[PDB]
């Protein structure tokens, strides 16, 4: 009961330029970047980071401006590689050990320490962190228990601490979160029920209320959200549609959540909040023919950009403009789906 994953991870460089990371046909992580912020078409082209990947990569900027990418290696350990100055000079790959059985996801703590979450060999959630802002060493791997059947998804909550969500072996959504307590720094796992058939994705509304999206057992998009910042949750509610990938979500320029997914015609579809109350738009097609979940990012000018694999395994993209969306164009490449779950 898994849905098609995204095939890249995107981030902005410190200067605003988007950069994407994916696994090529030779099983290496490759990357491609805007040569100046906000451009429609001026990209570097694809450059290899070498070696061998066995998961979807994940990138996050450090609090000093350096991008850092994470992937599972051929040994099933977590590996990482970083810019040595903002925008350039990759370190080469170094091991963070462990055995992971999901794709890794990255969080940044309010103090500037990166932290990675992944499923372990015992199907529990594990995590590992920088011990100082934007600097090694990293901690040992530590277990947060649970039984996971999806990638974890993480966001900062209204208390400024991480909250992590995953599907469990009852096919329901569960979460855990970090507190200020020394004795119980992380909560017990708590259920939000549901039957979900994709990876879940969490995001925060502009006012701090978390919201989670996932495909349901009827292949519609479903969602569940907090009734106030760091409060309890609604029931699961349907946004209808027929989604044939994991959903992706980002806040738009209007401060409203906007969800993207592949549809049953293999086009890219999207849907957005139209009020603060639970009002949403109609599902709306952006056309295209895609062979992955979408990945959504935002340019320095505030406009969204969506990436997805095309019919020939190249990376396609479509950009929001001041009044519309652009045409679909190709960034080339030959991407595989190396997702560690499926
Ligand atoms: C360090 O421990 C190893 O890596 C963790 C991330 C888990 O997969 C655990 O089951 C495994 O033995
Ligand atoms: C310079 O890069 C910093 O130190 C390295 C040794 C790694 O621990 C990395 O996570 C961190 O960003
Ligand atoms: C030092 O790092 C902090 O404390 C550890 C014991 C973990 O609970 C981790 O989530 C947190 O980031
Ligand atoms: C709460 O409802 C349950 O979970 C939703 C996310 C959907 O999968 C629905 O079909 C199922 O009955």
Residue numbers in the entry: 30 to 371
What are the paper's exact sentences on this?
In this article, we studied five members of the PLL lectin family from P. laumondii subsp. laumondii TT01 (PLL, PLL2, PLL3, PLL4, PLL5, collectively referred to as PLLs). All studied lectins belong to the seven-bladed β-propeller structural family. Each blade makes a W-motif composed of four antiparallel beta-strands (β1-β4) connected by β-turns and loops. The saccharide binding sites are located between the adjacent blades and are uniquely organized in two separate circles around the monomer.
